[PDB]
Amino acid sequence: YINSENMYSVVLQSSINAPDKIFSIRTDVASQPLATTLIGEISSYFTHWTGSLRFSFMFCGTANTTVKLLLAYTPPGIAEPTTRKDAMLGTHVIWDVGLQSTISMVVPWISASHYRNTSPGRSTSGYITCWYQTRLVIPPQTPPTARLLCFVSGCKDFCLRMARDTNLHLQSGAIAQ
Amino acid sequence: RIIQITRGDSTITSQDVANAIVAYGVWPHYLSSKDASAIDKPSQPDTSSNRFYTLRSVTWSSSSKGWWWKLPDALKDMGIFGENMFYHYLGRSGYTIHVQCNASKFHQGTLIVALIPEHQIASALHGNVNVGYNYTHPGETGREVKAETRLNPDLQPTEEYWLNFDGTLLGNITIFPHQFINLRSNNSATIIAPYVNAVPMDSMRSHNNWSLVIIPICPLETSSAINTIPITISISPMCAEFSGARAKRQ
Amino acid sequence: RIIQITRGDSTITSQDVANAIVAYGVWPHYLSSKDASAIDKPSQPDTSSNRFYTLRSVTWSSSSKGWWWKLPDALKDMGIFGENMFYHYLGRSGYTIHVQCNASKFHQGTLIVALIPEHQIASALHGNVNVGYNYTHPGETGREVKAETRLNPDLQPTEEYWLNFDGTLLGNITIFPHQFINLRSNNSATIIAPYVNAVPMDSMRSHNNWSLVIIPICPLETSSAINTIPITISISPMCAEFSGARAKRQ
Amino acid sequence: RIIQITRGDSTITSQDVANAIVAYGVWPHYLSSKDASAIDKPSQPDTSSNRFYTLRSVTWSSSSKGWWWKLPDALKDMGIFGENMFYHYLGRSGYTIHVQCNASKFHQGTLIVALIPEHQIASALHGNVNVGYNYTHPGETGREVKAETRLNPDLQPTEEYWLNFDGTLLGNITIFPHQFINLRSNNSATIIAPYVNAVPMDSMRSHNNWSLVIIPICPLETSSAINTIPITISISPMCAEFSGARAKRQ
Amino acid sequence: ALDAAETGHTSSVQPEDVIETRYVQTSQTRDEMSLESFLGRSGCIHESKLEVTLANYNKENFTVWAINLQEMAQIRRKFELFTYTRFDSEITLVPCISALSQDIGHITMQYMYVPPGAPVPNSRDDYAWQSGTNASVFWQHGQAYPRFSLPFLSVASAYYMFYDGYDEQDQNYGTANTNNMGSLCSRIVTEKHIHKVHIMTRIYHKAKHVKAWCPRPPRALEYTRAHRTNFKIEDRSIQTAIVTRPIITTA
């Protein structure tokens, strides 16, 4: 998917009676892939960060189609979850996919320190994790498929310190002209 | 016909639901100094347990017959709620319950959901028998209703759903606080209840002070290849309280 | 979620759209005596050109890759707007844009539309090369993105849509004023912008002071035999002005 | 020289003790809105955990060398305190501590008790080594000091008590809040402390934000056949708080 | 908590909506995040390397460089973040002498800002080293680092970070049209002498009293061609800052 739009997107399988994991990610602002977001790059230009992050999600599938889904966050010091019920013990939202397009939700700031370092080395901030709260149900002869697109931004809570020449980009040699 | 719900840390919605009737109109509340029996200032986990928790997926078909749970036992494993229950001789709590049951515009069928009191289940077998603890207290695993071969049958409850498993007629079951999942009417259904007992608080693990029933009053169907839909239920305890702290109950 | 739109003589609607964000909140306006460079009282065609005009049908498929335009060049043929542009050395205008993209309830896929500034396109080829005028100025004919064999490739722009054709990541493109055509969310999408430049007005044909991009972020599909849908875009110029009248530009 | 003590549900006394100095005179308290980092309203188990809990019996002899603990780890198993700790990424708590150490009128010897901060223990072995988690976090089992054969020695802390296990002189240890069990002076000793860190709250299981040391400064003896006495310590957490609820920590 | 991201507007804004928070004095200043901070730290811009030629000392020993922010990546990426920007400029010179000989002696060095249509010096002896009105400035061995404040220059309100067209007869597409600032220049001022030496000036700038115009997405890949946004490098492939993983269910 990398050389294309599709790395911004995930595909869902209406065929599956299961509770199971759809995807998961870190939450450290300058970790992959999040670093590549513009908040990611701005954080990558910085050494300290603070405050909670906004996350948002559109059910990009066929308008006739229904589901409800679990979006969840893992407070760290612990492995990334392996059952839906694990994520249900974490802070989470269940998406009523009503007429409205998007669910939006926040990883709460739960750093011990008022800031955290923007890039972890041997360190962690926690996980995003995503699960089939119901099965996805298309009505008959709809495409046997759906799409989801995922967004992030700084909340009103968000801030940075120690502006530094960013990790994210490299120059080799002379820039020609 | 839209709602959002928020308890302790966690939130719920349907955008195709008609609001819960509050059971008997009594919005949930803590015990009163006027009515209490227990002497201590009791355990208020508040937000950390008057929050939602949800059961494993059941799923249903035209062939399916029914499901139910008994509370608090159905929630014995709900972290804070579960252990705070098991570590006290007594407690009390009401509940907010929502059942999740969306289909397409192209399905038919209907479930009745009934919140129900002590719901004292009848045996399967005739004669000098009564229900065994393992089955009255199925935990979150619950009791789906099935056609066959449940062992220890002498201690099993009856499977007879249209006799409400106690020898009372279904359809009069609307005497309790209830709703219908009707796939045309709604995509979900909801009910909320205070605490209740003949006693101001109760021996949680020893007595299911509330119970919840869901019944396929009208058979599930669609022409679509998705011949079946899951159901799941989420519950938050309400004003949850516990008293007589000691070791973890076995 | 319904709108109607009226500019100069012509009107537009969607009854399944969420309103435009106005670009940076600045509702379009004429130049100011406080900021101007040009000396004359400039040409205000008003209603006769601050009115809608629309582009030839593009159409899209699961296999499709993207489309864009550069303004005012994309409107060089829009009668009054087009010639009033070509007959002046300078002008300025904002725009109201709506993209028309209805599907059935039974389709999925999504486009991002981004209004975008100078959007300085990168070459296709490596090395000591730059984009040729014919391609930077595609007129109303625009630039759809294709897999193959565009001649004069050394002077062609890159086709690399997910690198925004300039070596910047897509998905951060929401930095600009933007909308999604999402077939569930809406049947159309809209954006409006004032004039902008580092200069109070600009050499219209020599510099595309604004640009517009539409990208298949999620592939078009339906099970229906109508495997593809057109898109079309309509634009009205805003507060359009022109100065330094002389012959028609070639 | 008599005291009684009451926290959360449980009570303590000595009728031969001189009162605790409160550490730095700061009586324990919750976090402030002025100083906090964490965003939620945090977990206040209050009475159900700001109550006493006590460690397994150590016992001592003229031959004995010392004992210590690191907190909160030393209390990881204290029911409500322990799990509420393990289920949160962060928390904070101060402590009230009393050490129980009665002898007859016919015994001599003395212990120093020191509450101590981060107390960053030195390795046993020389060179490129550091202390392993199993030993920094001995749990309630604690670290008694012994003459011999502790395995994994490269990851063991030093046994060198009179060098405070960190290369600092004992006897200056009275720089910290401290008391003496002196068998003539008292039959017990006590200390209380607020929370402390460079941070407004901390990663409980990952960092022992406080530590407690007891040392046989003067050898135990009596002529009586009861050649040895147990010691035990009881602790209540103070103003205990927890934030960032998730699964149980391993 | 529900919205239409398709609006273009940012999503459901508020953190207190889905967390039962305690009140906190969230009280961390955004001032380091200010533009007069982020733009307003200096960085290097260009590299004026020269050799002192002997055989015609009088001819060769000068350099000229076309002023741009487009050939050192970090500074470039600060400005490759907007449509336009405006600022006054701290300019700072880090002259360095490298010896190819047993000594350097005293050395003195000229710089000149050559605005366009100044006569460009052709020779280390050119009359153009006279500078009645051009900003020309001097450095010598043992002197402190030279600096000057240069005000915002453009004929327009702000510098084009990008441009979408041409000079009016249709070549040089983009900033190579708009960004004709002319050039910096340098030249050894000491007369012919025996020491073979290299002079290198690292030149630095910080934008302050800054203003900026409509943010635009950051550069994803190595630079290539100063004015031009070209990025598809020769005999190479588009290895962006994104890194792949084995499965999307594994963090």
Tell me the three-class secondary structure of A91-117, residue by residue: EEEEEECCCCCEEEEEECCCCCCCCEE
- DSSP H/E element including A153: strand A146-154
Alpha-carbon dihedral sign for residues E14, E19, E20, E23: negative
How many CB contacts within 8 angstroms connect chain B with chain D?
A: 11
Question: How is residue B121 annotated by DSSP?
Answer: P
Which of D9, D79, D245 lies at the smallest CB-CB distance from B48?
D245
B60, B229 Cβ separation under 8 angstroms: yes
Chains touching chain C, criterion 3+ CB pairs below 8 Å: A, E
Place of tokens 């103003």: D239
When scoring B2, B3, B6, B236 by the number of chain E Cβ atoms within 10 A, the one with the most, hence best to mutate, is: B6
- DSSP H/E element including A85: helix A84-89
Query: Are the beta carbons of D250 and A78 separated by less than 8 Å?
Result: yes
Nearest residue of A to residue D249, measured between CA atoms? A78
Measured between CB atoms, does A171 come within 8 Å of chain D?
Answer: no
CA dihedral D123, D128, D134, D135 (to 10 degrees): 0
Longest dimension (CA), chain C: 60
A34, B155 Cβ separation under 8 angstroms: no
Which of D37, D38, D41 lies at the smallest CB-CB distance from E20?
D41
**CA terminus-to-terminus distance, chain D:** 44
Query: Are the beta carbons of E225 and A33 separated by less than 8 Å?
Result: no
Q: Alpha-carbon Rg of chain B, whole angstroms?
A: 18
Nearest residue of B to residue E19, measured between CA atoms? B9
Question: How is residue C58 annotated by DSSP?
Answer: E
Residues on chain A touching C215 (C-beta within 8 angstroms)? 5
- DSSP H/E element including C25: none
Backbone angles phi, psi at B190, to 5 degrees: -145, 150
In chain A, % helix, strand, coil (3-state, to 5) comes to: 10, 35, 55
C160, E232 Cβ separation under 8 angstroms: yes
D138, D212 Cβ separation under 8 angstroms: no
| Integer CA distances (angstroms), D14 to B63, C62, D185, D189, in order | 71, 82, 12, 8
B63, B148 Cβ separation under 8 angstroms: no
Q: Which of B152, B150, B149, B155 is nearest to B128 (CA)?
A: B155
Resolution (A): 7.1
Measured between CB atoms, does C108 come within 8 Å of chain A?
Answer: yes
Q: Which residues pair with B245 in a beta bridge?
A: B88
D161, D194 Cβ separation under 8 angstroms: no
Query: Are the beta carbons of D247 and A90 separated by less than 8 Å?
Result: yes
The rounded Cα D158 to chain-centroid distance in angstroms is: 18
A51: CB partners within 8 A, 6+ apart: A109, A154, A155, A157, A158, A159, E26, E28
Tokens found for residue E220 = 């994803």
Three-class DSSP category at D124: coil
- What CATH number is given to the structural domain containing A156? 2.60.120.20
B17, B187 Cβ separation under 8 angstroms: yes
Three-class DSSP category at E78: helix
Backbone angles phi, psi at A120, to 5 degrees: -75, 135
Residues on chain C touching E242 (C-beta within 8 angstroms)? 169
Place of tokens 């994210």: A168
Q: How many domains does chain A have?
A: 1
Measured distance CA(D117)–CA(D134) in Å, rounded: 19
E133: CB partners within 8 A, 6+ apart: none
Which of E15, E20, E24 lies at the smallest CB-CB distance from D33?
E24
Measured distance CA(B84)–CA(B90) in Å, rounded: 10
**CA terminus-to-terminus distance, chain E:** 26
Measured distance CA(A119)–CA(A45) in Å, rounded: 10
Q: b/e for B179-204, b at 16 or more Cβ within 10 A?
A: bbbbbeebbbbbbbbbbbeeeebbeb
DSSP labels for D147-179?
Answer: SS--SSTTTSBP--GGGTTTT--TTSGGGSSEE
The rounded Cα B196 to chain-centroid distance in angstroms is: 14
Nearest CA of chain D to the CA of A79: how many Å?
A: 9
Q: Alpha-carbon Rg of chain E, whole angstroms?
A: 24
**How many CB atoms neighbour CB E236 within 10 A?**
12
Which of B15, B54, B223 lies at the smallest CB-CB distance from A99?
B15
Three-class DSSP category at B80: helix
Q: Which of C169, C134, C128, C126 is nearest to C150 (CA)?
A: C134
| Amino acid (one-letter) located at D146 | K
Measured distance CA(A136)–CA(B229) in Å, rounded: 10
Measured distance CA(D237)–CA(B39) in Å, rounded: 24
Measured distance CA(E93)–CA(B13) in Å, rounded: 63
Measured between CB atoms, does E4 come within 8 Å of chain B?
Answer: no
Question: How is residue C5 annotated by DSSP?
Answer: E
B190: CB partners within 8 A, 6+ apart: B3, B5, B14, B17, B19, B20, B96, B97, B98, B99, B179
Provide the pairing of β-strand C143-144 with E62-66.
unpaired
Query: Are the beta carbons of B9 and E20 separated by less than 8 Å?
Result: yes
Measured distance CA(E100)–CA(E52) in Å, rounded: 10
Measured distance CA(D118)–CA(D209) in Å, rounded: 6
The residue segments making up the domain with residue A13 are 1-177
Backbone torsion region of residue D25, taken as left when φ is above 0, otherwise alpha when ψ lies between -120 and 50, otherwise beta: left
Question: How is residue E143 annotated by DSSP?
Answer: P
| Amino acid (one-letter) located at C98 | H
Residues on chain E touching B50 (C-beta within 8 angstroms)? none
Which of D43, D48, D87 lies at the smallest CB-CB distance from B43?
D48
Q: Which residues pair with C114 in a beta bridge?
A: C178, C213
User: Which residues does B contribute to its contact with E (CB < 8 Å)?
Assistant: 4, 8-9, 11, 13, 47
Tokens found for residue E50 = 């020269």
Measured distance CA(B127)–CA(E60) in Å, rounded: 117
Q: Which of D203, D216, D197 is nearest to D117 (CA)?
A: D197
Three-class DSSP category at B29: coil
Query: Are the beta carbons of A17 and B230 separated by less than 8 Å?
Result: yes
Give the count of alpha carbons within 13 A of E111, CB side only.
24
- What's the order of all strands across the beta sheet hosting D143-144? D143-144, D67-71, D210-222, D107-116, D178-182
The rounded Cα C144 to chain-centroid distance in angstroms is: 13
| Integer CA distances (angstroms), D29 to D98, D149, E22, E89, in order | 19, 43, 16, 52
When scoring E18, E22, E25 by the number of chain D Cβ atoms within 10 A, the one with the most, hence best to mutate, is: E22
| Amino acid (one-letter) located at B31 | L
Tokens found for residue D56 = 């397994």
Three-class DSSP category at B148: coil
Measured between CB atoms, does A114 come within 8 Å of chain D?
Answer: yes
How many CB contacts within 8 angstroms connect chain A with chain D?
A: 54
Measured distance CA(C188)–CA(C191) in Å, rounded: 11
Query: Are the beta carbons of E175 and C70 separated by less than 8 Å?
Result: no
Measured distance CA(A130)–CA(A133) in Å, rounded: 9
Nearest CA of chain C to the CA of A90: how many Å?
A: 28
Which of E154, E172, E229 lies at the smallest CB-CB distance from C167?
E229
C190, C43 Cβ separation under 8 angstroms: no
A135: CB partners within 8 A, 6+ apart: A14, A16, A17, A18, A67, B229, B230
Place of tokens 């071969």: B149
Place of tokens 């004039």: C195
B228, B44 Cβ separation under 8 angstroms: no
Q: Which residues pair with B237 in a beta bridge?
A: B95
Chains touching chain B, criterion 3+ CB pairs below 8 Å: A, D, E
Q: Which residues pair with E205 in a beta bridge?
A: E43, E91
Measured distance CA(E82)–CA(D8) in Å, rounded: 60
- DSSP H/E element including C135: helix C133-136
E128, E120 Cβ separation under 8 angstroms: yes
Q: Which of B67, B4, B17, B2 is nearest to B233 (CA)?
A: B67
Query: Are the beta carbons of E238 and A162 separated by less than 8 Å?
Result: no
Measured distance CA(A54)–CA(A157) in Å, rounded: 10
Q: Which of A57, A60, A72, A59 is nearest to A150 (CA)?
A: A57
The rounded Cα D5 to chain-centroid distance in angstroms is: 18
C192, C96 Cβ separation under 8 angstroms: yes
Measured distance CA(B155)–CA(B132) in Å, rounded: 5
Nearest CA of chain B to the CA of D30: how many Å?
A: 18
Measured distance CA(A36)–CA(A31) in Å, rounded: 9
Q: Which approach determined this entry?
A: cryo-EM
Question: How is residue E90 annotated by DSSP?
Answer: E
Measured distance CA(C130)–CA(C126) in Å, rounded: 9
**Which B residues 94-123 touch D at CB under 8 Å?**
none
C101, C111 Cβ separation under 8 angstroms: yes
Backbone angles phi, psi at B46, to 5 degrees: 50, -125
Measured distance CA(C212)–CA(B56) in Å, rounded: 49
Query: Are the beta carbons of E72 and A80 separated by less than 8 Å?
Result: no
Q: Which of E24, B148, B75 is nearest to A114 (CA)?
A: E24
Nearest CA of chain A to the CA of B2: how many Å?
A: 9
Measured distance CA(A142)–CA(A137) in Å, rounded: 10
**How many CB atoms neighbour CB C228 within 10 A?**
12
Tokens found for residue A23 = 């995807």
B196, B210 Cβ separation under 8 angstroms: yes
Tokens found for residue C230 = 């057109």
| Integer CA distances (angstroms), E75 to B167, E36, E70, in order | 82, 14, 8
Query: Are the beta carbons of C184 and A60 separated by less than 8 Å?
Result: yes
Measured between CB atoms, does E237 come within 8 Å of chain C?
Answer: no
Burial tier of C157 (Cβ tally within 10 Å: 0-12, 13-18, 19+)? buried
> Which regions of chain B does DSSP assign to beta strands (E)?
3-7, 10-14, 53-54, 58-60, 67-71, 88-100, 107-116, 143-144, 178-182, 188-193, 210-222, 229-245
Measured distance CA(C108)–CA(E212) in Å, rounded: 39
A45, E77 Cβ separation under 8 angstroms: no
**How many CB atoms neighbour CB D72 within 10 A?**
27
Nearest residue of A to residue D205, measured between CA atoms? A77
Q: Which of E39, D204, A150 is nearest to C110 (CA)?
A: A150
C167, E221 Cβ separation under 8 angstroms: yes
The rounded Cα E40 to chain-centroid distance in angstroms is: 13
Per-residue H/E/C for E211-237: EEEEECCCECCCCCECCECCCCCCCCC
Place of tokens 């347990």: B49
Tokens found for residue C41 = 């009282």
E242, A7 Cβ separation under 8 angstroms: yes
Which of B53, B229, B232 lies at the smallest CB-CB distance from A137?
B229
